[PDB]
Amino acid sequence: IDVHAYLAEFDDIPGTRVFTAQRARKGYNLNQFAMSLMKAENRERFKADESAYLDEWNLTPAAKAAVLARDYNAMIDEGGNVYFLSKLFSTDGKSFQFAAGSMTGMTQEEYAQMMIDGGRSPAGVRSIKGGY
Amino acid sequence: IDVHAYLAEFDDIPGTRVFTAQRARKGYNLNQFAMSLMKAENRERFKADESAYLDEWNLTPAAKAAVLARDYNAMIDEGGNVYFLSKLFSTDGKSFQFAAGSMTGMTQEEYAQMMIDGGRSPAGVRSIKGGY
Amino acid sequence: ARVTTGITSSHIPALGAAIQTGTSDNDYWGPVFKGYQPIRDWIKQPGNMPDVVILVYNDHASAFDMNIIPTFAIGCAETFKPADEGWGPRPVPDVKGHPDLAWHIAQSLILDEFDMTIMNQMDVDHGCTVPLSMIFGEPEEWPCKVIPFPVNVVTYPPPSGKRCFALGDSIRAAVESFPEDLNVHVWGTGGMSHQLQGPRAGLINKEFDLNFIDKLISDPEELSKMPHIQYLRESGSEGVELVMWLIMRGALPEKVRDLYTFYHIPASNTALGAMILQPEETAGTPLEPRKVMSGHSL
Amino acid sequence: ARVTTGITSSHIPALGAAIQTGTSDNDYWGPVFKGYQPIRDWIKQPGNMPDVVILVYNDHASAFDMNIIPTFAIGCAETFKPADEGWGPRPVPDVKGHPDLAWHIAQSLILDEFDMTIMNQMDVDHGCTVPLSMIFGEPEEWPCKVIPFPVNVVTYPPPSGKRCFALGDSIRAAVESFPEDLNVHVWGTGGMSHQLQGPRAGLINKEFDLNFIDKLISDPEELSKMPHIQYLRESGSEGVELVMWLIMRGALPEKVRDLYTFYHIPASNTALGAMILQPEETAGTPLEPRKVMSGHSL
Ligand SMILES: [Fe+3]
Ligand SMILES: [Fe+3]
Incomplete structure (x- = not known):
């Protein structure tokens, strides 16, 4: 019933950035650029010259760098959404598992071993103020 | 609640064809064709050769003949919707009053005078079975 | 942060054309634009001009084609x-x-x-x-x-009068909870009675129209119970646009004061209506005259 | 005119890529595809094949971009x-x-x-x-x-679990009023627990997932009260897809019989879940085994 209270709670989850309106508004351009890669021709053009391609999307200097550096954590900080961005690492030839692990700082090998072992435990990573 | 009961009564209204799902499905190509007249480029091409333009829309011979004859009642019979079709008479430079009057059988002038006098009275045109 | 007033108005294309072609002051259109003058003079007054206007209207196959049809x-x-x-x-x-x-x-x-x-x-x-x-x-x-x-009122079924009314109350709540203290208006546009299609085109039901305005002011809850078929039968197939006026009404409290009302026949194929409503609690003084009904048949 | 069964399943792209690269039988994927075999066999049996499938899922920024975001x-x-x-x-x-x-x-x-x-x-x-x-x-x-x-579960807020649950019942009512005697299915896809983003990516909560499956069968009404925040907290930010499961569940009566349940960890970044539910009244005979749990961690 209270949109502000509803939204405030998401700030208490560690290592998570819920895709709210505020983020959507910020990453509008970055997410729309990513959407453009659903077209084979656009992918070819992007690949030809990435920097030039990005210039037609009015990204903020930060967002542009994040893309060229394929830093998905930085891209999410700029308002990008994982599902929109999947178009980017997809044209790169990477999987969802690759992108996710790349954001944990773990090596592709360790991340894979962790998933094999049961994944990351929620214990301790649920609340920032509650410590559980 | 009874979707069937809801649509069934639309049948008892004289001189009226309510845009139900049934009509929308039947007139999908005709309405999407009209929509295309929103782009100036299409407007001009269509005007250059209507028949050739219409052929790209896979309309039924009845729907195509209705368009070529500018027969709005016929167009509505083929599933056309008045708001989509407004793109067509707007392309011709006709007003909404011209289009409406053209479907009543009165001369443009008689229709205009009638509106001035207060419009068509609902008396006798509310129910087919009732006759009122 | 605050929905101060509710306004309804026609939005037929013929009015924009009268303006465009500089004929808004001829014999036919003159009475219509004159009827809007009081609203024009009222809204400009300091404290009457809104910061934001939430304009409720139905897309006329412009922004939405047959591939995407959203209810709201x-x-x-x-x-x-x-x-x-x-x-x-x-x-x-x-x-x-x-x-x-x-x-x-x-x-x-x-x-x-x-x-x-x-x-x-x-x-x-x-x-x-x-x-x-x-x-x-x-x-x-x-x-x-x-x-x-x-709001979709093009492809059936359009939302119910009951749904629209309720939505209006939801909008008021969202507005009141907005931090900034904005002067917000809700405009319900469209209508009134008219039919654009077929042999029955030209239909006008002043009795229906005037009754609608009347109940919209004093008994909106009962008016929101009116079924689609009644709009279609009585006010013409296109008169169903009036359901949108319930959204505007629902954003206003139970007690409202009608500061001004204009009704005129004809405006192209329609019966034209426009009004200003404010919550009784903070309403201003009604205009003089409070109600105006023009047209050769009025 | 009949909603005979409710099925839920994962819909991650990796499963699609496994099939494509003929790696569906390797050491990693084999257990997963082994779990779907009973379903593949069941459904293909005479009289189990539905006429229509109402497939509930969330567009992953494919059909909809940032310009049009529909809830349902x-x-x-x-x-x-x-x-x-x-x-x-x-x-x-x-x-x-x-x-x-x-x-x-x-x-x-x-x-x-x-x-x-x-x-x-x-x-x-x-x-x-x-x-x-x-x-x-x-x-x-x-x-x-x-x-x-x-269903929108990408941009916040997504519909509520309560809304999703109510929607399913409405879909069943709609199906039941369709004049033709069709064998209709309602599949709820997505999930289970997982996080695709940030330092917390890789999160799996079998406890949560297993409890979700349990309650969805026995007490969907209470489960439909679980707020968004809890899914985000316990099942990962992307685990919110599970709400879509309430749509499938709501289309089935109060008493359902679970014919099959398969839960496996991991399937890419997720915990995979799949089951077949049927109105107790007309439920077929459960599968053998009726419940299975794969994964090095299970
Ligand atoms: Fe309109
Ligand atoms: Fe998904």
Whole structure:
């Protein structure tokens, strides 16, 4: 019933950035650029010259760098959404598992071993103020 | 609640064809064709050769003949919707009053005078079975 | 932060054309524009001009074609360009929205269980811009921000009168909970009685229309019970647009004061209506005259 | 005219890629595909094959970008093409819909006060085709008609669990009023627990997942009260897809019989879940084994 209270709670989850309106508004351009890669021709053009391609999307200097550096954590900080961005690492030839692990700082090998072992435990990573 | 009961009564209204799902499905190509007249480029091409333009829309011979004859009642019979079709008479430079009057059988002038006098009275045109 | 007044108005294309072609002052259109004068003079007065206008109207197969048909949509974009409906883009200023309030309202309606469709890019047709021209004249820029709120009344079934009424109350709540203390208006546009299609085109039901305005003011809850079939049978197939006026009404409290009402026949194929409502609690003084009914048949 | 069974399944793209690269039998994927075998066999049996499948899933920024975000949509198109999500269109047959039943449900839902967005043209991404590949294999053409039903769970807020649950019951009512005696299925796809983003990516909560499955069967009404925040906290930010499962569950009566349940960890970044539910009244005989749990961690 209270949109502000509803939204405030998401700030208490560690290592998570819920895709709210505020983020959507910020990453509008970055997410729309990513959407453009659903077209084979656009992918070819992007690949030809990435920097030039990005210039037609009015990204903020930060967002542009994040893309060229394929830093998905930085891209999410700029308002990008994982599902929109999947178009980017997809044209790169990477999987969802690759992108996710790349954001944990773990090596592709360790991340894979962790998933094999049961994944990351929620214990301790649920609340920032509650410590559980 | 009874979707069937809801649509069934639309049948008892004289001189009226309510845009139900049934009509929308039947007139999908005709309405999407009209929509295309929103782009100036299409407007001009269509005007250059209507028949050739219409052929790209896979309309039924009845729907195509209705368009070529500018027969709005016929167009509505083929599933056309008045708001989509407004793109067509707007392309011709006709007003909404011209289009409406053209479907009543009165001369443009008689229709205009009638509106001035207060419009068509609902008396006798509310129910087919009732006759009122 | 506050919905101070509710206004209803026609939005037929023929009015924008009268203005465009400089004939808004001829024998036919003159009485119509004269009837809007009081609204024009009222809204300009200090403290009467809104910061944001939530304009409820139905898209006339302009922004939405047959591939996407949303029951309720809200424009959360920064700018909205006038659509080209066959005569080229309407020669009026771009509509500037209010993303902050718009997105806030959108988030609130979904949390309040209304299955909204968020639009971040859409052209606004005559349904949205004609009312702005009628009330704000021909400025180089619109005097306030506008949040387009397209409602489907084109493809059946349109929402129920009961749903619209309820949605109106939801919008008021979202607005009141918005931090900034904005002067917000809700405009219900469209109508009134008219039929554009077939042998029965030309239909006008002044009895229905006047009764509708009357109940909309004093007994909206009962008016929201009116079924679609009754609108269609009595007010013409296109008169169903009047359901949108219930959204505006629902954003206002139980007790409202009608400051002004204008009814005229004909305006192209329709019976034209326009009014100003404010909560009795904070309402202003009604205008003199309070009600005006023009047209050769009135 | 009958909702005979409810099925839930994962719809992650990796499953689709496994099939493509013929790696579905390797050491990693084999256990997963082994778990779907019982379902593949069951459904193909005489009288288990549905006529239509109302497939509930969330568009993954494929059919909808940032400009149009519908809460609830329904594909009433005759055909749907697989979307190109960066690798080129999924090499699977085109999805054939059921416009008659689709339009019927669309109209019923709106009359039942759901603000539906009707789609008459839309590509279906992996969320819709992967489950098809998992249950129907690699036919030259899908064995039945499919009605896509995209739900927004990408941009906040997504509908509420309570709204989703109520929607399912409405879909059942709509199906039941359809004049034809069809064998209709409602599949809820997505999940289970997982996080695709940030330092917390890789999160799995078998406790949560297993509890969700349990309550969804025995007490869906209470489960539909669980707030968004809890899914985000316990099941990962992307685990919120599970709400879509309440839509499938709501379309089934109070008493259902679980014919099969498969839970496995891991499946890419997720904990995979799949089950077959049927109204207790007409439920077939459970499968043997009726419950299975794979994974090095289970
Ligand atoms: Fe209108
Ligand atoms: Fe998904």
